[PDB]
């Protein structure tokens, strides 16, 4: 499934993920597209900061969900 990660510049990152993907795994996928170090990414969804050792399912991030990125 694809999900969108909006940055504050306005650009939107599209990612191909699974619900079983860990947040750390997603951040690594971001590094793979943008070059951003994972240990400098803070991901938000549903007014919550995403925890590295948790997964997408732990927040109910489904297809067409959009997250926010803080640098």
């Amino acid at each position: 499934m694809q999900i969108f990660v909006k940055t504050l510049t306005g650009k939107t990152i599209t990612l191909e993920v699974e619900s079983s993907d860990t947040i750390d795994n997603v951040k690594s996928k971001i590094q793979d597209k943008e070059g951003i170090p994972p240990d400098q990414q803070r991901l938000i969804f549903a007014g919550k900061q995403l925890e590295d050792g948790r997964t997408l399912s732990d927040y109910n991030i489904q297809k067409e969900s959009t997250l926010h990125l803080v640098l």
Partner: protein
């Protein structure tokens, strides 16, 4: 809608599962399956 974990861990829970997150789902399933 917001099916929050029954154990009150502060995280969300998958409605497809037993109303619990991925972490608590296995932890509880082990005791339910064994018993």
């Amino acid at each position: 809608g917001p099916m929050l974990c029954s154990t009150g861990c502060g995280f969300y829970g998958n409605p497809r599962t037993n109303g619990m997150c991925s972490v608590c789902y296995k932890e509880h399933l082990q005791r339910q399956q064994n018993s």
